[PDB]
Design a protein around this motif. Structure first.
Motif, short mmCIF file in Angstrom:
data_model
loop_
_atom_site.label_atom_id
_atom_site.label_comp_id
_atom_site.label_asym_id
_atom_site.label_seq_id
_atom_site.Cartn_x
_atom_site.Cartn_y
_atom_site.Cartn_z
N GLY A 1 -3.06 3.13 2.58
CA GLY A 1 -4.07 2.18 2.20
C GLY A 1 -5.54 2.47 2.67
N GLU B 1 0.62 -1.22 -0.14
CA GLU B 1 -0.06 0.05 0.11
C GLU B 1 0.78 1.22 0.03
N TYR C 1 -5.12 11.14 -1.47
CA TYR C 1 -4.88 10.70 -2.83
C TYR C 1 -5.76 9.79 -3.48
K LIG Z 1 -2.37 2.59 -1.55
#
Ligand SMILES: [K+]
Ligand SMILES: [Cl-]
Ligand SMILES: [Cl-]
Length: 164
Positions: A30, A11, A18
């Protein structure tokens, strides 16, 4: 190697909001914020998750805090799922980490739909499970990552993450 280090590799770590591989707003390691296309909606989710009014930016410690929660939640979800629990319980610790990684990326529900693969894993038919796992939108959309996960289920070793 362990589940935390493994997912940290898959991740990455970004401290500003983002978009993930699917185009969804995310932050940290993540941490999916929302599937909504509204950046404001994403920021709202971020503040609720952190507990403060952020500027769409968090600290490393805050990113790690959400990550810990996320990993625990994935494990928890597996354990609550009638299709996933049995497979998870049947696996060794290394392969269990591979399953947790899949669930963190796709959700309990997503993973529970890999019925045939799940059965092969439960049967310990490693090579066949590996071939079956590759026949998926998951593998086609994120092939490098899918390949690493598949190798861990195939071999029961962390070699695929060695040198990353
Ligand atoms: K990611
Ligand atoms: Cl959260
Ligand atoms: Cl990938």
């Amino acid at each position: 190697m362990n589940i935390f280090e493994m997912l940290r590799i898959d991740e990455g770590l970004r401290l500003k909001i983002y978009k993930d591989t699917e185009g969804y707003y995310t932050i940290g390691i993540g941490h999916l914020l929302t599937k909504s296309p509204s950046l404001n909606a994403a920021k709202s989710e971020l503040d609720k998750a952190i507990g403060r009014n952020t500027n769409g930016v968090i600290t490393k410690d805050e990113a790690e805090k959400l990550f810990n929660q996320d990993v625990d939640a994935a494990v928890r979800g597996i354990l609550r799922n009638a299709k996933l629990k049995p497979v998870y319980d049947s696996l060794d610790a290394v392969r269990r980490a591979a399953l947790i990684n899949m669930v963190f990326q796709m959700g309990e529900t997503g993973v529970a739909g890999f019925t045939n693969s799940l059965r092969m894993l439960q049967q310990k038919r490693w090579d066949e499970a590996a071939v079956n796992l590759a026949k998926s939108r998951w593998y086609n959309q994120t092939p490098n990552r899918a390949k690493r996960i598949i190798t861990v289920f195939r071999t029961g070793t962390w070699d695929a993450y060695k040198n990353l």
